[PDB]
């Protein structure tokens, strides 16, 4: 290509169009592109339809593109990975009519302040959803009904104050949940359901230790080796398990899993 780097790795074709002052998709890219990098351009509006000529395209990065609108015309039947991180999106692109094979969606570090009812409808193959660093306060009911195969979910570093009780319903395969550094104060009873969850990050929330925290206290007991602290810059296999990171607010660091619950339920005596 005269502008983008093209890197052939056996059958694989990875095209690097990163940081090239592009304001539009270049028109002469290989028809056989597997992976397209469009990071750090200026793609304010981007049309998914423009990528239809690329039949073998499985991964697209539009990260750090000052993107504000992603037009969802047309259909990309083989796109598996879409990275929209570090942009300016003020509402979530609604993609289920467009990317039926999507397994990975990253929209971390945008300007999202809520997700609409049905946001993920039609993304039935989704396995990973990253929403770290937006401005979310809660989630709509039924958010993950469309996505029963979900494996990893990040809501880290939002400003969440309520989680719907059935959020995790029918997630038979969930393996990582990141909820650290929000404004959460309680967990609805039964929130976790009955499936094993190997990695939960729950620290940096002002948990309210009253009788309604008992559910969470008992879950933390049964799951102490599954509760971790996020460390930046490393692999997750490098990170410390620490059930005591999860602390009662207004407490001086009293660990929720320790919560006595003495005299619950509170009644007149």
């Amino acid at each position: 290509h005269p502008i983008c780097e093209v890197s052939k790795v056996a059958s694989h074709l990875e095209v690097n169009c990163d940081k090239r002052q592009l304001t539009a998709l270049p028109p002469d890219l290989p028809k056989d592109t597997t992976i397209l990098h469009l990071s750090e351009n200026l793609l304010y509006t981007f049309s998914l339809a423009t990528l239809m000529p690329y039949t073998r395209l499985t991964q697209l990065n539009l990260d750090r593109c000052e993107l504000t609108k992603l037009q969802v015309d047309g259909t990309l039947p083989v796109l598996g990975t879409l990275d929209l991180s570090h942009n300016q999106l003020q509402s979530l692109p609604l993609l289920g009519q467009t990317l039926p094979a999507l397994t990975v969606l990253d929209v971390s570090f945008n300007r999202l302040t809520s997700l609409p009812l049905g946001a993920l409808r039609g993304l039935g193959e989704l396995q990973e959803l990253y929403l770290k660093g937006n401005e979310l306060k809660t989630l709509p009911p039924g958010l993950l009904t469309p996505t029963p195969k979900l494996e990893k979910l990040s809501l880290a570093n939002n400003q969440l104050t309520e989680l719907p009780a059935g959020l995790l319903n029918g997630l038979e395969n969930l393996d990582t949940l990141l909820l650290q550094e929000n404004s959460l104060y309680t967990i609805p009873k039964g929130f976790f359901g009955s499936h094993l969850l190997p990695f939960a990050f729950l620290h940096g929330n002002p948990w309210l230790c009253n009788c309604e925290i008992l559910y969470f206290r008992r879950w933390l007991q049964d799951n102490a080796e599954n509760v971790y602290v996020w460390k930046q810059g490393v692999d997750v296999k490098a990170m410390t398990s620490n059930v005591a990171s999860v602390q009662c607010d207004n407490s001086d660091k009293f660990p929720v899993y320790k919560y006595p619950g003495k005299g619950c339920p509170l009644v007149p005596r």
Binding site: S108, Y130, S154, V234
Partner: peptide
Amino acid sequence: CTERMALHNLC
């Protein structure tokens, strides 16, 4: 390195 890379041990 990103959250996503970290969770796959690809940092």
